[PDB]
Amino acid sequence: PLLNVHIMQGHTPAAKTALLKALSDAVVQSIGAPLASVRAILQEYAAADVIVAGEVGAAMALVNVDLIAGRTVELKAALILALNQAVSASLGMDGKDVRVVLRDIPKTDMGVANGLSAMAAGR
Amino acid sequence: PLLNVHIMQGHTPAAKTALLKALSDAVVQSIGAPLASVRAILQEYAAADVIVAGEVGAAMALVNVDLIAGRTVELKAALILALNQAVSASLGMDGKDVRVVLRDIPKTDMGVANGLSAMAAGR
Amino acid sequence: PLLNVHIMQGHTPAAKTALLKALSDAVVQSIGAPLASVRAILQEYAAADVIVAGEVGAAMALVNVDLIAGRTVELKAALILALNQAVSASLGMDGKDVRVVLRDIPKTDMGVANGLSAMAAGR
Numbered sequence: 001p002l003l004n005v006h007i008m009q010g011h012t013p014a015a016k017t018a019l020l021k022a023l024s025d026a027v028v029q030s031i032g033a034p035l036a037s038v039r040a041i042l043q044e045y046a047a048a049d050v051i052v053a054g055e056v057g058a059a060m061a062l063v064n065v066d067l068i069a070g071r072t073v074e075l076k077a078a079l080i081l082a083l084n085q086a087v088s089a090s091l092g093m094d095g096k097d098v099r100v101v102l103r104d105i106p107k108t109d110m111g112v113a114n115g116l117s118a119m120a121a122g123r
Numbered sequence: 124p125l126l127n128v129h130i131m132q133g134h135t136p137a138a139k140t141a142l143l144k145a146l147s148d149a150v151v152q153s154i155g156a157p158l159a160s161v162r163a164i165l166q167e168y169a170a171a172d173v174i175v176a177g178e179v180g181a182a183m184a185l186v187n188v189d190l191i192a193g194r195t196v197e198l199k200a201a202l203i204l205a206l207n208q209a210v211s212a213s214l215g216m217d218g219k220d221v222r223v224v225l226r227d228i229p230k231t232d233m234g235v236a237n238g239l240s241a242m243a244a245g246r
Numbered sequence: 247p248l249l250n251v252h253i254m255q256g257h258t259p260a261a262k263t264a265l266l267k268a269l270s271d272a273v274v275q276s277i278g279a280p281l282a283s284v285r286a287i288l289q290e291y292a293a294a295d296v297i298v299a300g301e302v303g304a305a306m307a308l309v310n311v312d313l314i315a316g317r318t319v320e321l322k323a324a325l326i327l328a329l330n331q332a333v334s335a336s337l338g339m340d341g342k343d344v345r346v347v348l349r350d351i352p353k354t355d356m357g358v359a360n361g362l363s364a365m366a367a368g369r
Contacts, residue, residue, distance in 0.1 A: 038300070049143075171263070225351070
């Protein structure tokens with residue numbers, strides 16, 4: 001799965017390091033994805049650049065997951081839950097302030113190493 | 124709906140604040156989304172970081188919307204139009220330079236507070 | 247097709263211009279998209295903000311493509327391959343460190359100029 005993570009400015013590099021590791025482990029543990037398929041990249045936002053429920057500057061975290069289609073509803077649920085808890089724990093956040101979005105990508109639509117599709121790679 | 128907005132560098136803080144509020148209002152009023160479900164986060168780009176129709180540095184704005192599946196085509200048209208107008212009015216841009224992308228996320232695939240899925244929470 | 251590209255910090259301005267042009271060319275050449283429909287925007291990441299296969303700071307590149315649904319499996323394979331090669335050639339990267347994700351967007355869900363869906367304007 002390919003994760004892009006969006007957090008508020010203000011956490012330390014060490015805290016953000018632990019978040020990346022915790023998200024990666026959360027993917028491996030919750031759905032059994034091979035470690036080599038797990039990537040996550042992080043971006044920080046100033047409070048002035050976010051709005052939540054009509055309130056500019058309210059805290060949020062967002063984990064977007066592009067992953068190969070075919071996971072059961074139950075594994076998808078485990079993944080959302082594990083990622084939400086990984087963010088809340090790593091950043092000292094309330095889980096109500098975190099959102100996780102899964103985008104099911106068909107195997108013909110997901111690239112892997114050297115520009116082959118996941119279907120081409122026999123995933 | 125979760126919005127990530129991509130705009131050119133150089134706009135005033137007031138205009139970016141007005142943009143975020145106008146985007147949130149556009150979602151609530153065009154599709155009747157619960158206010159608590161509406162989040163938007165903003166990212167700025169240097170001209171050197173964009174290419175449009177082969178022209179490097181062409182001004183653009185982009186609104187990506189991850190929203191729960193099931194809205195009618197009619198509601199999606201109202202949403203796309205309302206978001207385009209929110210960008211155009213807030214930033215003083217031509218609507219031809221703005222793009223809106225809606226990504227339908229099944230209720231099993233959309234996280235809500237505390238890492239339950241939208242389906243789990245009875246949406 | 248609307249591309250958002252994610253690369254590591256530290257590449258030359260010439261390399262990033264070449265990357266934007268090569269990505270645009272790859273889309274036109276591989277699937278026959280009209281040049282006017284092709285946009286790409288670029289974001290750079292610090293080593294501290296990425297994790298790949300559990301390794302914080304491992305170099306990566308990511309090309310996310312939102313495109314109107316309907317392209318065949320073969321055209322998608324050509325696109326994923328061409329985009330991976332545009333990144334690797336432009337940035338001097340190993341193609342194993344690049345990923346491409348395609349997101350099929352129904353015409354009802356893809357905004358075009360002035361807040362109309364691609365269906366309201368017919369793509």
